[PDB]
Write an enzyme that holds these catalytic residues in place. Structure first.
Site, PDB file in Angstrom:
ATOM      1  N   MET A   1       0.829  -1.199   0.000  1.00  0.00           N
ATOM      2  CA  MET A   1       0.000   0.000   0.000  1.00  0.00           C
ATOM      3  C   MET A   1       0.867   1.253   0.000  1.00  0.00           C
ATOM      4  O   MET A   1       0.536   2.249  -0.642  1.00  0.00           O
ATOM      5  CB  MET A   1      -0.928   0.006   1.215  1.00  0.00           C
ATOM      6  CG  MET A   1      -2.345  -0.430   0.893  1.00  0.00           C
ATOM      7  SD  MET A   1      -2.572  -2.214   1.036  1.00  0.00           S
ATOM      8  CE  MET A   1      -3.666  -2.529  -0.347  1.00  0.00           C
TER       9      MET A   1
ATOM     10  N   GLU B   1       3.885   1.863  -1.359  1.00  0.00           N
ATOM     11  CA  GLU B   1       4.320   2.182  -2.713  1.00  0.00           C
ATOM     12  C   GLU B   1       3.124   2.570  -3.574  1.00  0.00           C
ATOM     13  O   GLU B   1       3.258   3.328  -4.535  1.00  0.00           O
ATOM     14  CB  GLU B   1       5.054   0.992  -3.339  1.00  0.00           C
ATOM     15  CG  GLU B   1       4.398  -0.349  -3.057  1.00  0.00           C
ATOM     16  CD  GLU B   1       5.085  -1.492  -3.779  1.00  0.00           C
ATOM     17  OE1 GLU B   1       6.330  -1.559  -3.732  1.00  0.00           O
ATOM     18  OE2 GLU B   1       4.375  -2.319  -4.392  1.00  0.00           O
ATOM     19  N   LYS B   2       1.953   2.050  -3.218  1.00  0.00           N
ATOM     20  CA  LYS B   2       0.728   2.352  -3.947  1.00  0.00           C
ATOM     21  C   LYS B   2       0.413   3.839  -3.847  1.00  0.00           C
ATOM     22  O   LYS B   2       0.040   4.474  -4.834  1.00  0.00           O
ATOM     23  CB  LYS B   2      -0.439   1.526  -3.400  1.00  0.00           C
ATOM     24  CG  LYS B   2      -1.710   1.647  -4.223  1.00  0.00           C
ATOM     25  CD  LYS B   2      -1.620   0.846  -5.513  1.00  0.00           C
ATOM     26  CE  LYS B   2      -1.871  -0.632  -5.269  1.00  0.00           C
ATOM     27  NZ  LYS B   2      -3.001  -1.148  -6.090  1.00  0.00           N
ATOM     28  N   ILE B   3       0.578   4.387  -2.649  1.00  0.00           N
ATOM     29  CA  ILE B   3       0.327   5.801  -2.407  1.00  0.00           C
ATOM     30  C   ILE B   3       1.276   6.665  -3.231  1.00  0.00           C
ATOM     31  O   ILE B   3       0.861   7.639  -3.860  1.00  0.00           O
ATOM     32  CB  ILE B   3       0.491   6.147  -0.916  1.00  0.00           C
ATOM     33  CG1 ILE B   3      -0.337   5.186  -0.058  1.00  0.00           C
ATOM     34  CG2 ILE B   3       0.082   7.590  -0.657  1.00  0.00           C
ATOM     35  CD1 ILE B   3      -0.197   5.425   1.432  1.00  0.00           C
TER      36      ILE B   3
END
Length: 86
Positions: A68, A70-72
């Site tokens: 999550m 790295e997702k942001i």
């Protein structure tokens, strides 16, 4: 630009509002698992006062993780390079 006040208030509100947009997409497609981890991350930012800068700094918040995190950052990178109008 009607609001926007330099007082006591959030600084992002962009990645959060968006993290919700995508979360709704999965919920519609029938992704109980996906929408679970996504919304969970949003819950963490719901209490986050300071802005974001790195994935590690985001993962430091309870309720999120590495994937999550790295997702942001990806959402902050416009996805890849340039922005597109879906």
């Amino acid at each position: 630009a009607q609001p926007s006040s330099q007082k006591a208030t959030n600084h992002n509100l962009h990645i959060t509002e968006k993290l919700e947009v995508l979360a709704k997409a999965y919920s519609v497609q029938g992704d109980k698992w996906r929408a679970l981890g996504y919304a969970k991350a949003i819950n963490a930012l719901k209490s986050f006062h300071k802005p974001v800068t790195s994935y590690q700094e985001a993962c430091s918040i309870p309720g999120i993780g590495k994937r999550m995190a790295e997702k942001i950052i990806e959402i902050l990178e416009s996805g890849h390079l340039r922005k597109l109008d879906h």
